[PDB]
Amino acid sequence: MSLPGRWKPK
Amino acid sequence: DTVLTQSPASLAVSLGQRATISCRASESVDYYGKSFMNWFQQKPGQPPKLLIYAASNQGSGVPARFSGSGSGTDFSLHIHPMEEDDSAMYFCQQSKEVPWTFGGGTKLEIKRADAAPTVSIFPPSSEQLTSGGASVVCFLNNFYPKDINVKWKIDGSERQNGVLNSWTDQDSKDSTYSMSSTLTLTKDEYERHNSYTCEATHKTSTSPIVKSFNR
Amino acid sequence: DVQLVESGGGLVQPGGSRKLSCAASGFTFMRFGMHWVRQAPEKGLEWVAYISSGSSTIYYADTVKGRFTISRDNPKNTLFLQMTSLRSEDTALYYCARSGGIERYDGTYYVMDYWGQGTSVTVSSAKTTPPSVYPLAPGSAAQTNSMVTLGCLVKGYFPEPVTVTWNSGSLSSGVHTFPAVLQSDLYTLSSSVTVPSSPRPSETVTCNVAHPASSTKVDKKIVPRD
């Protein structure tokens, strides 16, 4: 899932 | 927080060889099939530069000589072949959790042939004596390895107090080190002695290199 | 291309406040999350704070959480770090780094892909002091081969830094400016140069020392003793 400032799913 | 244990704290690798730096995470940094593990190169007096992101992906202007491997809590940065401008501080970092954490870093230096230092000694300047001060300086330039001991002698007697030392970082062209040592006394105490000596013991010899001057 | 320039650092008394700025250019600033990372003298990198592109998500380091405030002004392409209750342990070079997104078939992994040169923050109550500059000329028994080594001792200044040049930058080879050592709230540094023997004292050799914090600039000619 989305981890602010680290990982943003498509 | 997930703590990162980076080893070794420092290393010396010959040109052409591989330099591997390891980084252990206290907690797995794996997240959704990816490893949130990054590596930075920091040249002296320069900002850090991204090298590898996501454990094994090379950043923008990163040479193929820089590789990275690992997953979970086990990670390594590889540099092969090692080249001249590779001497620098390297840091691992995890981007899975907040706070973002970095390894302690490792100073990577070029292992070059042993070179003995060029020792020069300097007396207090007229202007400093006018001020009521007396610093004696010793420059030990361009040697390898970095390890070297300098003892100060006043009339043959070893002095321990009022002496400040400093080492330059491994140089860009010759990959050597340089050191500076200053002994500071007042003008009145300096004027109480005759001989001042800089004696340096370095791996390149048993007997120390000695420089001195008489007041 | 992408340029980040921090500013605003300097000496601050313990318990003091200070605002640092980070000027962005070469990219679409409003589109990237940004960070502040600090590096203490002889220390590793320590993450300080994060802010999303639109300021919705802000994250801080625990040791900074109450005293430091991160913010940005997208229209002005500037990132800020407001610092209050400064502690000696906040003394560090502060860098702003961009949070760059990298595209994958499944998402975008973020990492600090661009960093600035940084601003130095010294949290101390020691007083700003100009350097005393002294020439280091060979002693009487001045034996020497083809080259001669000279130098300058820059004693008792505060705080860092000091820039040292020789012959206004003409003499750039064979120069060693050693890192400053802090002894009793006063810094000291020295610099050496090796010039061919024939050039001294025939040609003049002088060190130019500037201490920004004090508006200091000094030229110090190395004249032969005697």
Side-chain angles (χ1 to χ4, degrees), chain A residues 1-9, chain B residues 1-83 85-215, chain C residues 1-225:
Chain A
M1 225 158 292
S2 201
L3 297 183
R6 301 156 275 156
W7 180 251
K8 205 287 216 70
Chain B
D1 311 326
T2 109
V3 185
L4 306 187
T5 308
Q6 183 169 344
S7 61
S10 69
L11 75 178
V13 180
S14 302
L15 295 179
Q17 303 313 126
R18 165 180 51 64
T20 292
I21 295 172
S22 307
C23 185
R24 176 67 17 161
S26 63
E27 273 289 65
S28 181
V29 297
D30 290 1
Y31 179 75
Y32 284 77
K34 287 164 284 294
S35 292
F36 288 59
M37 183 54 238
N38 319 297
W39 297 89
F40 300 81
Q41 173 185 75
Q42 182 186 245
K43 236 92 152 195
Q46 294 231 281
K49 167 203 165 70
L50 180 66
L51 253 31
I52 293 304
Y53 65 87
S56 54
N57 301 281
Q58 299 188 46
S60 172
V62 182
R65 305 189 323 257
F66 291 88
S67 68
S69 54
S71 68
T73 55
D74 316 22
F75 300 92
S76 298
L77 165 73
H78 308 289
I79 306 171
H80 179 267
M82 171 79 192
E83 294 185 14
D85 289 319
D86 293 352
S87 177
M89 262 296 260
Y90 295 82
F91 298 94
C92 50
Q93 173 215 62
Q94 63 84 31
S95 50
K96 183 188 177 173
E97 325 274 13
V98 176
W100 277 262
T101 51
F102 298 88
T106 129
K107 292 196 67 71
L108 168 71
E109 73 178 48
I110 295 283
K111 196 193 289 177
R112 49 151 295 141
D114 290 7
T118 317
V119 194
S120 50
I121 195 175
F122 308 83
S125 73
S126 170
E127 36 233 274
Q128 192 185 194
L129 292 170
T130 292
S131 79
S135 301
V136 190
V137 184
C138 188
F139 289 129
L140 304 287
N141 295 155
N142 303 66
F143 57 89
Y144 190 83
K146 189 182 180 297
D147 305 281
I148 191 182
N149 189 256
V150 173
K151 21 279 129 180
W152 279 95
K153 261 90 179 304
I154 303 179
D155 285 336
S157 293
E158 194 191 322
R159 181 65 183 278
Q160 300 175 171
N161 169 233
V163 305
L164 80 144
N165 294 12
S166 184
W167 295 246
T168 293
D169 280 350
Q170 186 167 53
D171 197 66
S172 300
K173 282 74 168 188
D174 58 11
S175 291
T176 65
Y177 290 89
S178 292
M179 173 190 182
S180 174
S181 191
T182 319
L183 199 212
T184 300
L185 326 159
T186 66
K187 155 204 178 293
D188 287 337
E189 146 80 338
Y190 167 78
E191 253 155 64
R192 281 185 67 265
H193 304 98
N194 308 333
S195 195
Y196 292 85
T197 301
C198 182
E199 184 180 300
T201 327
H202 179 267
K203 253 176 46 58
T204 47
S205 194
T206 48
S207 33
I209 300 179
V210 187
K211 300 291 168 172
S212 29
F213 62 92
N214 195 104
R215 262 193 49 252
Chain C
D1 52 27
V2 174
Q3 175 175 214
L4 269 13
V5 183
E6 305 89 347
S7 55
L11 210 221
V12 207
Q13 222 145 291
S17 291
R18 190 81 163 200
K19 176 145 140 291
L20 314 180
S21 296
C22 159
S25 58
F27 65 114
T28 311
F29 184 70
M30 79 156 26
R31 291 184 47 226
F32 303 73
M34 297 287 300
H35 297 266
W36 277 104
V37 178
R38 59 182 183 192
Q39 183 167 43
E42 251 168 283
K43 212 270 276 64
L45 265 19
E46 182 185 44
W47 169 73
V48 176
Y50 164 81
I51 183 166
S52 58
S53 53
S55 299
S56 309
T57 303
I58 290 179
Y59 295 139
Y60 293 100
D62 274 327
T63 51
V64 139
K65 182 162 56 82
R67 326 167 293 113
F68 290 12
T69 301
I70 188 171
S71 67
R72 67 199 288 164
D73 186 333
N74 283 346
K76 282 188 157 191
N77 285 276
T78 305
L79 174 76
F80 312 104
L81 183 66
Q82 169 61 59
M83 309 170 108
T84 59
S85 287
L86 266 334
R87 275 279 50 241
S88 285
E89 51 268 27
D90 289 323
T91 286
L93 170 64
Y94 289 68
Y95 295 103
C96 61
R98 191 242 276 178
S99 180
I102 308 149
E103 313 304 354
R104 317 191 70 260
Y105 84 114
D106 57 352
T108 161
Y109 184 97
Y110 295 87
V111 64
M112 298 162 206
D113 60 8
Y114 283 98
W115 294 60
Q117 186 182 76
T119 1
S120 3
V121 170
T122 307
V123 186
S124 175
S125 34
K127 206 274 286 178
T128 16
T129 319
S132 292
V133 189
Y134 308 119
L136 281 39
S140 180
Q143 179 43 224
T144 208
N145 304 266
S146 62
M147 306 299 289
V148 302
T149 296
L150 277 22
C152 271
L153 180 67
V154 341
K155 227 182 172 307
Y157 63 93
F158 195 89
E160 276 277 65
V162 124
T163 61
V164 182
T165 60
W166 284 97
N167 280 11
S168 305
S170 306
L171 251 43
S172 54
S173 221
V175 176
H176 281 110
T177 297
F178 312 77
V181 188
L182 179 58
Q183 298 219 211
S184 312
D185 65 72
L186 275 201
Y187 282 109
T188 294
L189 157 163
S190 49
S191 194
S192 58
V193 240
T194 303
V195 308
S197 290
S198 46
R200 228 273 315 199
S202 62
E203 325 307 350
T204 311
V205 179
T206 117
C207 74
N208 323 288
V209 182
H211 178 44
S214 66
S215 314
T216 285
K217 251 186 73 272
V218 53
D219 285 335
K220 188 54 68 177
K221 191 183 175 194
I222 324 299
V223 302
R225 312 174 110 275

